[PDB]
Every structure is written in structure tokens, then in C-alpha cells.
């Protein structure tokens, strides 16, 4: 049956697609996060 | 080559002049009895209000909990609690002079 | 010569140089206790004072200025160090990781945290420094420093 | 059902997002007293 | 034509079967970005 | 000898030792009085100042002084603790439920609350410590304090 | 052995002084009467002030109302009423510490 | 009539949907409080 | 009809929602009014 | 032919009465949902 | 007796009660005007403090001291209260309608207001109890109060 | 029983010591008038300054306008007003408890 | 004509649910504005 | 042309509107001045 | 034929005559909510 | 009578109205040179108190006096209004044209600028007039006015 | 009718009594001019730090923009200059009241 | 004549110009010293006061009068100097390029910069010369300036 | 023509006199010397305190970090750092002003 | 050819929209300005 | 081409737009510098 | 037929010109409106 | 084969209208930091 | 697989997206801090 | 049959490469736009 392989197929396909999502959506947030409380600190410290 | 009584008239005038100078010497050092009896006075009281002011503080006294203590160290520079250690040596400083300078002030008296 | 005995009854030797002598060795013998008592009570005040020490009626605040110290280490201000809250030791950064094994973990990379705390110990140092000179120069005003 | 399992790993998933974000959270807390009580103490001097 | 609408109705709830072990990785995968993203906003 | 005559006609036999005796005497019996003065003048300042107590004069303000108080207890102080505004007294933390016996029912859960509430009171030491730490500091300043 | 009036004359100088010095005493008794008064005259000045003082206070009196109870007490920790009445303390002793100190400084009258 | 009982059936699912979906809403509105509310009062604290 | 009901219960729900968000709103604005109470006290002595 | 007509309105009213009872439920489920974070992000 | 003659040539009677009566008569004339003039200028200064009243050279500041005033109405003071910028007296809480008469008709209903008012009032109290407190605690001391 | 000249002399020096002390006298009147002359100054000078500070607040008048008094008569509570005439009569009470203090300060000259 | 029998009912419709939803829409605006006034009066006082 | 027609009475709406809020903005002011100044006076005073 | 083109397009302007009419009221209700919540949050 | 001889011999007349009328007459005379000096330092500093002038020692400082100024306007203050910042003169209002000639051209109507300006008013009015009672109320003591 | 040497011993009383009062009549013009060259050394001083202090705000003088005239302008009520002034002339008030009351408290010396 | 006789035994020819004149010559001599001395020490104090010196006892504070500084030049305080914090000098304006080279390079056109900084300025200026102004108008005041 | 005695009496006189003025002129001396005394005493406390205070600067020194440079050059006016130097300048007018003052009223001592 | 005058037409019904749009937003636009503004100036004065 | 046209009318009007944005930016911040100017005097004066 | 498939790419390409004509006025409207509304938010 | 080219082209189409947007984009943010950056310099230097 | 380079070029790009945001916040970082420190001086001297 | 089945097949992996590499242009540029429009507005 042909159609059980395509959607283990399509199954893995999106399986890596979760998985560079959460590599960039990691560097995005750690990013946003560094800023943030760069910004915090310094707005704190003065 | 003298009247009688002249010379016991000179005298009585300087045991006059030697028991009056006697009373001021007295009394000067009465005056400065009076003044390091107001200096104790002074310092007595500075005395105890320091010691009802260091009372009052151990029963209010309270600790940090074990967390923030990651991020005060986490931000914390090398140079604050010297900081902070300067603060608190200057206020000291500044009292004791002030308090000797209350004393110098003292010679006014 | 009547006239020389009438002198002779009614006259007795007096010389200026004992009279003048005599009292004014009473005088500058009591007028040296009163010197003296002036120059002691200079010399106390100004021995409490500059921490040289009193003796007298003045040897009793002896200990009450020695209770106040001299320089900046004071006694009495020494007693509220035993009660100064307890405060952390700064030390090296650490990078604070989330969710540490799992797919989400990111961790400050504290790169930036050590710029932020050069640029935070230099504002304490501009703090500190303008309350000290400000300190100094308003010794004599009668305002907190 | 299929459902149901899917909606309890949502549900644990988000229990320990809630628990790293307390404890960041509470380090950022941390920073940031120390922040303020740091720099009170030169203003207030002053 | 009995077996083929059996044949239709079991293949029909194998593909379900499928079709929601598929969606489940999605939503999980979707819900956990917007999960992460809010708390992560959320704490600092 | 007519000498000797006119020596006896014209002659008063006086003792020094009797002139400097009456004329110190009454001088002493005056001083003393005059010392007496001083030093009960002395004496009912210094017990006005230090809480023992002064007689004659100043014994009107006997009763001021003990109403202003010692120590830290102060009669004239005390009237305005009447007045003070009644605030709640701390006690244990009872979390809140929103929406109770709702499917949308949350409560706080109270475990952060212990924490929020040991550091309030590290805050509220630094702070007073701080502050009688200054004010004892800026006593002879004509601060308030 | 001496003239007459040489031991009046004595007399009489010694009377001129014993009046003198004794006319010394009585302004001496009149300054310290003056120095009473004066303080006599600051403190009651000072009882004055708290009278007037005390008695603004009653009318406008008001209360925490009953709700914002529940709040104060979900956070308020162990130490903050007694932090509140230290201040108050400090404020008293300080308080009369310098009334005292002022009755000190009275001694240079 | 089939049709009866399948809109039973949904309504029944649909039901249990919302139950699992107030589950999940309440912890995370719950949480969301908790760091709210410690944010505030020591952001007022300090 | 069955739409007048259904918008008569939201009003409802909508009700109770309100009345228990004035509650808690009531008690953290006692808290928040605790807070900068008990903190004024020593800043302004200091 | 007529009768036809009106059993098919018939069933048409009875699907309706039903997809209205399924669609309240959906509704009030939703507001609910969107008033309690609403309210509760309001009063903290 | 030549000596009796001699003596009666040259004396004269004088009495010591009547030489120390009239000297001591003299002194104390003008002494008892000294300490009039001390007791009336100490009377003069303490009256312009208290309120009594002062005659004499201080009689010209007893209009000064009026005008300054005693207890709390200072007519000095009482001059700048002509200009008092006018505020509104506070009056019962109305509701604020918004779009009255449209669809969209809703009205603040003032039961919070009041709450919120017996808050405002408690602050406003500690707020000016704390003030009256330190200003009497800070009278000696050189501060605005 | 005594020589002459010993009651001219007597006499001279009764003359001599209440000439020295009426001056004395005179100078002591002098003083008090000079102790009532600087009062009389230091008052002056206060009236003078009130006067000043009491006419600028004529030209800077202004009043709220007819609007914003709903809003604060919807807010301000019973003991608005009351609490702001308490801090205007505590400012007027120290203002006249310092000038009243001052002028007793003034016994010491 | 059916349809304009029609299209007047679905327009009754329509102005009944225009009413119910203005009903709803007052009271939920008029909640918000109280605590947010509430709030602010609060914050602005201590 | 019922567009017109509809435009304009959206404009008067929206007049309408503008007038109230108007109208309630101004109370909301004076409130809040008047918080501000009766605070500032005892704050001012210590 | 040109007859039932005719009568189809005046049924059709007729119709397009009340669309316009409930889409105004429909239209000015959802119009007159937003500016209210809008509005009433501005001046608060 | 030898007796009165004698008397004749050792006798001076001397009256008592012409020695004690020269004494008092020289004392006098200086004294009256004391009492002048001390009036003319209580007129000098009283002159320079006052503005009415000083003569003698105190003529130098007729000019520093002249120079700090009296009643509000001084010399030594005018000098920093020199340098006084510059700062524009209140107009009427005019509206602020966003997009003029444009299709999204709108004004800001300035009818409710006219408002604020008067709340402003008011304010800037309610804080002179509170900073210039505390100024009168705070004078004695030593704080910025 | 007295012995000789009387009027001579009384002649040189009143000497001696004037000439001392004569000292002390110029002892006293000393201090006056002590306390006059106190005065001017005080005013001096105070010239000299208004000269200074006058000079330092030559340098760092600056302007506003062009710009921002109008919103200024648009905002500004018509009693912000006058409450400006007004504060100005009650610091330069304050100022000679001050000056004036330390010259009357030199009275003291 | 015996009378002539007995005044000559008991008589001494004394001259009232050269006892008073020797009296006069000494007293002058002492009270010439005496006013030295006070002129001394009144101008030692003026000139430690105003700069010029002091000679004898107070020549020991000419050093620390010296080192006190006049003007605005003060030694003591140019101590502090040493330990001023570094500051950047003020340039001319860089505009700042994001993305240098990239199809996103946008840079801050810098025109407004220099707005800023002129208001900037103005506020600084407007900032010191009240300062200054408050300074001196509280310079009898106890306060810090 | 005079009786014997009497000049050796008015010697005896002005040599009495002579000796109480020199006694005086001593204790005028002494006087003054206390007072350098004071001066000097005042004068080492502040140099002390200023010794002291300039110590503790040079442990708690830091600087700026090379970043931050940038933007703060960005937006730095000609006229900052002339303000903080005048600043500077004009408290250390003020402090020797001060010294200066207190220096003149040592005259009254 | 019929289509080119329909194009015509819907196009200057677009335009008539636009206008009628554009005179909404600027009035829209000018309130909200107008009240934030306001705002604005008196927070800063108070 | 017509988009290039139109995205250059487009460019133009937001420069336009940019313009008059700036000019009302540059007279609302002179409004806010004089408020706090005059503000800050009094309150500083007390 | 050429010639139909030729009028009909010629047809097709003069509505294309039309229907750009009305789009580049559509969209310049709404985004000149999205512009105001942003460029007036942020000036304030 | 047609389609290639055509492709091609919506490619060319893509890419000048991605050039045009970048360049909108850049003009809008560039204009929105200034003003941004105006406004946060001015309200801290008051 | 296009996919996985296509996921690497953003990463790449938001990569120098945040190099660039990170040089752009220490300047106005720096120029926070020192409008502060410069106007600080001159408000705490009076 | 089964060579038009290959065809057709080619030709659809043929235009999948198109789409492909289309897509990723477009996807690119629009994710380049909303990564610097938040990265400007998170930095300033």
C-alpha cells in the first residue's frame, strides 16, 4: 500500500521541518532575550 | 625716714590685692570645672544615644533568601562593595570631626 | 634741737626697695598659679582635641574621645558593623541556561553581561566619586555627608 | 483516543515551560534588586 | 459490494489513524514554538 | 623727754595680725557664699541636663524636663501615638482562588508569595539599617533624623 | 605703734570692699535668675507647640477601609510594623537628644 | 436516523475537547499570573 | 429562539467573570497600596 | 412529490435545531475562553 | 600737759558709724537703681516672648510682636491667605453618564469611587500624620517644617 | 579721735567709688538700648520681607477653569481640604515658634 | 415575491442580534472602564 | 447612491462618539489632576 | 426571450437593492462597536 | 598757745566742694567721650542695618552695603540676569497644520489647547504660590529660599 | 583745714583714675575698629565670590533652537514668564534679608 | 618761731609734675605695649583672613591658609583632580550605518542629531545657571551649593 | 611742702598699679596665643579629612569601556563638560569661601 | 465594447469610495490626535 | 511597466508623508521641553 | 481559429491594462491610508 | 518548452518586486528610527 | 534537499541581522548612558 | 500508456524544481523584511 509509505514519508518531512524551525526559533529568541536584558540592565544602572 | 603707719598701710594694701587675686584665681578655676563638666556632659550623651541606636537594630534584622543570589552575582562588578565600604568610612570619618570639632569648638569657654 | 627730736619720735625707716620687693613677690607667686591654671586647661582642650590626651579635670573625657576614635576607624561607628546585612561576593559570570537538555535550550552568552558590568562599575565609580568631593566640599555647611 | 494523549503532552510540555520561565524569571528578579539596591545606596548618599 | 464498502470503511479509518498521528506532531510542534516564545517573553 | 609725749599724745597701738584677720575673715565669709552660688548654679544645670534633678531656681523646670522624657520614652512624644493610623498586623499567606467551584478555577498558589515576601523584608532592613546608620551619622549636622 | 585713723582708715577700706563684692553677688544671683527664666520660657515654648500641634491631628483622622485588608496581608512580611516603630523611636530619642543637648549649651550663659 | 446520533457523538467530543481545553487554559492563565504578579511586586518592592 | 438564550447566558458568564476579576483587581490594589506604603515609610525617612 | 417536499423541510428543521445546539456550546466554550484571559490580564 | 594740747590741736571726732552709714546709704541708693534697671530689662524681654508685655525701651516692638501673633494665627501669615488659589469642596459622588440616551448609554457606577475615596482618605492622613511627626521632631534642628 | 584729713579723705573715696559706679549705670542703660534697638531691627526686617513676598502673588493669580471640577469633586474625599488648612496652620505655628525662640535667644546679650 | 419576505426576515434577524450584541458590548466596556479607572486612580494616589 | 448615504452617517456616528469622548477624557483629567495635586501637597510638605 | 432578460434584470437590481440594504445596517453596527471600544478606551 | 601754733604749722585749707567738683568735672568730661563713642558704633552699624548710612570706621562699607541692594532689587544679584537665558514670549494660539493642500490635511482645532493652557496656569500659579509661603514660613531657618 | 598732703594724695587719686579711664575709653575705639574691619572683610568676600562666580557663566552661554519655538509658543500661558521673575526677585529678597540680619547680628561684638 | 621749726622737721618737698609725670611716663609706657599687642593679633586674623599674612603666633597657618587656596584655586581640593573620571571629548557629529554594503544599508541622516544636540545644550546651560544662581543666593544659608 | 610718707605712698601706688596693668598685658597674650592655637587646630582637621577622603579614591577607580564611546561622542554638545567644570569650579569657590568666613569670625574670639 | 465602460465605472466608484474614505480617517485621525495630545500635555504638567 | 510606477508614487508619498511627520514631531517635542522647563522651576524652587 | 486565439490574447491583454489601472489606484489608496495613520501615531 | 520561460520571467517579476520592496522598507524604517531615536534623546535630556 | 538550504541561508541571514542590532543598541546604549550621566550632574547639583 | 506516464511524471518534478526554487526566493525576501523590520525596532 503505497499511500502508508507516503505518509510516513510526509510524516519524517515535517519531523525535520519541526526540527530546523526550532534551531532558528532558538537563535531568534536567545537573541531577542540577550537584547532585552542588555537593554534592562543598562536602563536599571542609570 | 617715715610717719608711722605708712608702711603698715602699704601692707594691708597688698594682703588686700593678694586675697582678692586669690578669689579670681578661685573662681577661674571653678569656671573650668564648669567647662569639662559641660565636654563629659556632651560626650556622655552622644555616648548613649549610640548605644539605644545599635539596640534597636537586632530585632528588625533580616537575611536575603538563597535565591537572587545568582543574579546579584551574575551582575554584580568588582568594584561595588568597596563602594558601598567607602560610603559607610567617609559617613565615619566625617562624624568624628565633626566631634572634634565640636571639642576645639570648646576652647571658647 | 627740739625740732630733731620731734622728727626721731614720730619716724620710722621704711625702705621702698623691701615694700616693692615683698609685694611684688606675692603677687607674681600667685600670679604664676594663675598662668599656669590658664596655660593647663589650654593644653587639656587642645590635648583632647588633637588626640594627645588630657590630664586634670579633663582626664575623664580621656576615654569617652578614645570611644570616639581618630582618623576613620570610630568605636562607636564600629557597632553597627556586626548588624550590616550580608550581601553576595561578586565573582565571575556564569551563563544561565534554559531548558538545559531539551530541544529549546539557549543560554546567555554573557559576552554582553561583562560589558554591562564594566559600564555599571563605571557609573558607581562617577556615583561615589561626586558624592565624595561634594562631601568635602561641604564640610562646613551644616548638611549630611 | 488519540486526543486526549495529545492534549495531556500539551499539557506537560507547558508544565515545564512553567518551570524554567519561574526560574529564570527569578534570576532576572535577582539581577535586577541588585541592580536597584547598588546604585540607591551612591544616590541616596548623594 | 458489501466487501468493497467494508474495504472502503476500514482503509478510510486506517488513513484517520494516520492523518492524526501526522497532526499531532504538527500541533505539538506549533504549540510548543508559542508556548516557548511567550514564557521566554513572559520571564525576562 | 618731751619726745616720748608727743610719741604717746599722737599714738594708736594696732596689731596687724588683728586688721588682716577681721578684714580676711569677712572677705572669706562672703566668698564662700559667692563660690556656694556658683557651683549650686553648676549643679542644677547639669542635673537638668542629665536627668538628676535641680533645686531652687531652675526647680520650676524640673517638671518639664521629665515630661520631655530620657532614654527614648518622651511624654510629649507619646501623645501623637493616640492618632497613629491602624495598618494590619502580618500574619501566615492564604492564597486567593478566582472563580472557586468554576471550571475556570485558578488559585495562587502562594509558594512565590513566601519568596516575594522574605526579600521585601531583606529590603525593608537595608533600608532602616541605612537610615539609623545615617542618622546617627548626622547628629551634631542640623539634619533631620 | 601708729598714727590715729590709720586703723580707721583700714576699717573703712575694708568695708568698701566687703560691700562692693557683696553687691557682685546680688547681680551674680540676678544673672542665674535670668538664666532659669530663660529656660523656663523654652521648654514652655516647646510644650506649646506639641499642644497645638496634638490637637490638629484629631479631625482629620481617618481609616483603612475593609477591604485592601486581604491584600496588605497576603504580603506583608514579619518585619515591617516593627521597622515602622523603630523610626518612630529614632524620631523620639533624637528628639530628646537634642533637647538635651540644647539644656547643656545652656551652661555658657 | 444515523444522523441523531452522529451529531450526538460530535456534540459528546466537542464536549470533552472544551473540558481538556479549560484544563490547559487555567494552567497556563494560572501560571501567567503567578510571574506577573511576582514581577510587580518587586519591581514596587525595590 | 435559541439565540436570545444563548446570548443571555454569555451576558451571564460575561457577569460572573466581572464580578470575580473586581474581587481579585480589589485585593492586588491592596497589595500594591501595602507595598509602596511600607517602602515610603523608610525611603522618605532616609 | 409533495409529500417528499415536506420531509425534507421536516429533516432541514431537525438538522438545524441540531447544528444550533452544537453551535452554542462551540460559542460559549470560545467566549468563555477569550473573557476569562481577558478579565484575568485586566485585573492583574 | 603739753601732750594733751598737741593732741587737741590736731584731731578732729570723727564717728566710723556715721562715715560707713552714709557711704553704705550712697551705694546702696544707686545699686538698688543697678539692679532695678537689670530686673526691668529682664522683665521687658520676657514679656516680648511671652506675650505679657514689655515697657519702657522694648514698648516699641510690643506692635511688632502683636502683629507676628502667637498660637497658630499669625497675622503676618494670614496675609497671603487673601490670595489662596480657590479649589473645589468636596461634595457626594455622582455618576458620570457617557452617550445618554443612545444604545451605547453607560455610567460609572460610583460604587468603586467611594472605595477608591476611603482609600485616598487614609492616604492622605498618614501622608499629613507623618509630616506633623517629623515636624515636631525636627524643631531644634535647622530644618523646613 | 583722729587726725585731720583721714574724714576728707574718706569722704573722697565714698565720692570717687559712686561716681565710678553711676557711670557704670549709665553704660549698663546704654546697652539696653542697644539690645532694643537690634530687636527692634530684626523684626523690622521681617515685616519688610513679608510685605515684599505678599505683593508679587497679586500679578501671577490664576484659578482653575470651570471644567476639571467635576472629575475633582467625583475624586476628593471629606478630609482634602482639612489636611491641606493643617499643614498652612503647622507652617504658620513654627513660623512664630522660631520667631518667638529667637526672641528669647535674644536674653543672652 | 418570496425573496423579499425572505431578505426583510433575515434582516429583523439581523437587528435583533444588533441589539443583543450591544447590550453585550455596554456591559463589558462598562466593566473595563471601571477597573481600568480603578487602577489608575489607585496608582496615581500612592 | 446608498453608499453616500451610508459614509455620511458613519461620520456623524463617529462625531458623535468624538463629542463624548470629549466630554469624558476632560472628567477623566480633572480627576487626575486633582489626585496629583492633593498628593503633591502633604508629599511636598515632608 | 428579450422579455425574460428583462424581467431577470430587474429581479437582479431589485435584489441587489435590498442586499445593499441589510449590508448598510450589518455594516454600520459592526462600524459603530469598534469605534465605541475604541473611543471609550482613548479617553480612559 | 602753742597748741594752735603748732596747728597753724602742719595745717593746708582745703575744701571739700572745689577737690570733689574738679574730680567730678574731669570724669565728666571723659566719660561723656565714652557714652559718644558707643552711640556712634550703635548709629553706624544701626545706619548700615537699616540703609540710613554709617559715618566713621563703618564709612567704608557704605559703598559694599549700596552694592548688595535693598528691598529686592540688588546690584550684585542684576549681574546674572545678564546672562538670564533667553526664553520665547507667550502668544495666542495658533493651529498646527499637518498635510497642508493635501487630501489628509487636518488641523489641530486649538480649542482644547486653550483649556490646557488655562489648567497650566493654574498649576504654575498653585506651585509660586506654595513655593513662596514656604519661603516667608522658612526664613528663620537655615534652608534654600 | 587738714594736714599737707591731703589735697596732694587726692589730686593724684583723681589722676590716676583718669588716666585709666582714658586707656579703657581707648581700648574700646580699638575693638569698634576690629568689629568695623570684620564687617568690610565679610562684604569683601562676598563681592568677590559674586565676581567669580558672575564670570564662569560667560562660556558655557547657549540658545534655543530655532526650532521648538512654536510648540513653546503654541503652550506657554500668559503667567509662566511672570512666575519666573517672581521667583527670581524672591531669591534675590531672601538674599539681601539675609545679608541685612548678619549686619544686625553684628551688634554683638 | 618753733612752729617754723616742727614744720620743717616733719616736711618733704614733693613736686606734683614729676610724681605724676613719672606715673603717666610708665603707665603710657605698659599701654603702648598693650595696644601693639592688640593691633598685632587684629592684624594677623585679617590677614590670614584676606590673604596677606600673619606674623608670630598665627604665622603657623600661613602654610595651611596657603594651602587652602584663594579664588577658586584650591590645592586641597585639586587632589581630587587626579582621580576625575575620563570623559569623552565632545566631536563633530559621524552618522551611524546599519548593514554596511547590504541591500538593507540605512544610516542616520544625522540632520537631526545636530537639533538635538542644540536643545540638548540649551537645557544644560538653562540646568547650570540656575544652579549658579541658587548657589549664590544660599551662600549665608546652611545649605550645600 | 608735703608730710614724709606721702610720696613714698603714691610710688607705692603707681608701682601697684603698674604690676596689675603687666599682669594683664600677660594674660591679653596668653589669650591670643589660645586663639592661634584654635586656628590651628581647625585648620589640621580639615587638611586630616582632606588627606583621608583623597585616599579612598584610588581603589574603587574604573573607566569607561572602549564601547559607548561612539554613541556618546554621537550626542555630546560643545558645552558638557564646560558645565561639569564649572560645577566643579564653583564648589570649590564656595568651600574656601567658607573657610575664608569662618577665618574672619575667629575675630571674635 | 461593454467591458471598457464597466472598467470605467467601477473605477470612479472606487475613487468616490477612496474619497469618502479618506474624509472618515482624516476626521478619525484628527479626534485621536487631538485627544492624545491632550493627554499628554496635562500628565507632562502635572 | 505600471508596478514600477507605482511603486515609485508609493516611495514618493511616504516621503511626502515623512515630511510633515517630522515637521509635527519637531513642534510636539517643543511643546513637551516647554512643560517640563516651566515645571521644573517651581518645582525645583521647592 | 488563429484569428479567434489572436483576438482573444489581444482581449485578454487590454483587460490585463485595465485591471492593473484599477489596482495601482486601489492599493496606493489603502496604503496611503495605512502610511497616514502610522506616520500621524508615531509623529504624536 | 513554455513553461521554463515563463517561470523564468515570474522569477525576473519576483526579484524586481522584491528589489522595489526592499527599497520602500528601507526609506520607512530609516524615517521611523530617526524619528524614534528624536523622541527617546529628547524626553531623557528633559 | 532545497528545504534544508533554504532553513540555512535565513539562519545565516538572521545571523547578521542580529550582528548589525547588536552594534546598533551598544551606540544608542551609549548614548542613553550619557545623556543620563550629563544631565544628572547638573539636576543633583541643585 | 506507460511512457506518457513517465513523461507526465518527469514533467511534474520538472516544475516542482521551479516552484521550488521560487518559492524559496519569495520566502527569503519576505522573512527578510520581518526579521529587519523587528530586529531595527528591537535594537533602537
Redesign the interface.
Known amino acids: 500500500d503505497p499511500a502508508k509509505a507516503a505518509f510516513n514519508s510526509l510524516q519524517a518531512s515535517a519531523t525535520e521541518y519541526i526540527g530546523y524551525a526550532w534551531a532558528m526559533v532558538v537563535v531568534i529568541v536567545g537573541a531577542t532575550i540577550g537584547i532585552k536584558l542588555f537593554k534592562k540592565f543598562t536602563s536599571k544602572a542609570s | ?30 569656671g ?16 548613649g ?2 548605644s ?3 539596640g ?10 538563597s ?18 565600604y ?19 569648638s ?4 | 634741737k627740739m625740732a630733731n627730736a620731734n622728727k626721731g619720735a614720730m619716724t620710722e625707716n621704711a625702705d621702698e626697695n623691701a615694700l616693692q620687693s615683698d609685694a611684688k613677690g606675692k603677687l607674681d607667686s600667685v600670679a604664676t598659679d594663675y598662668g599656669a591654671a590658664i596655660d593647663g586647661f589650654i593644653g587639656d582642650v587642645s590635648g583632647l582635641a588633637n588626640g594627645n590626651g588630657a590630664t586634670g579635670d579633663f582626664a575623664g573625657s580621656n576615654s569617652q574621645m578614645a570611644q570616639v576614635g581618630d582618623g576613620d576607624n570610630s568605636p562607636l561607628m564600629n557597632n553597627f558593623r556586626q548588624y550590616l546585612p550580608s550581601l553576595p561576593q561578586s565573582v565571575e559570570c556564569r551563563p544561565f541556561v534554559f531548558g538545559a537538555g531539551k530541544p529549546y535550550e539557549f543560554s546567555i552568552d554573557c559576552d554582553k553581561i561583562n560589558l554591562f558590568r564594566g559600564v555599571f562599575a563605571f557609573l558607581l565609580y562617577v556615583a561615589t566619586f561626586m558624592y565624595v568631593f561634594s562631601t568635602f566640599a561641604n564640610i562646613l555647611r551644616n548638611k549630611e555627608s
Chains 1, 4, 8, 9, 13, 14, 20, 21, 23, 24 share one sequence.
Not at chain 2, 86 to 104: C, E, P, R, T
Not at chain 2, 106 to 109: A, E, G, M, T
Open positions: 625716714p617715715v610717719l608711722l603707719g605708712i608702711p603698715l598701710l602699704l601692707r594691708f594694701l597688698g594682703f588686700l590685692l593678694v586675697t582678692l587675686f586669690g578669689y579670681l584665681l578661685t573662681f577661674l578655676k571653678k573650668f570645672g564648669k567647662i569639662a563638666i559641660a565636654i563629659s556632659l556632651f560626650l556622655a550623651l552622644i555616648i544615644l549610640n539605644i541606636l545599635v534597636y537594630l537586632s530585632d528588625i534584622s533580616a537575611q536575603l533568601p535565591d537572587f543570589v545568582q543574579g546579584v552575582q551574575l551582575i554584580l562588578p568588582s568594584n561595588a562593595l568597596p563602594c558601598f567607602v560610603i559607610l568610612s567617609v559617613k565615619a570619618a566625617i562624624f568624628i570631626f565633626d566631634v572634634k570639632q565640636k571639642i576645639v570648646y576652647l571658647d569657654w
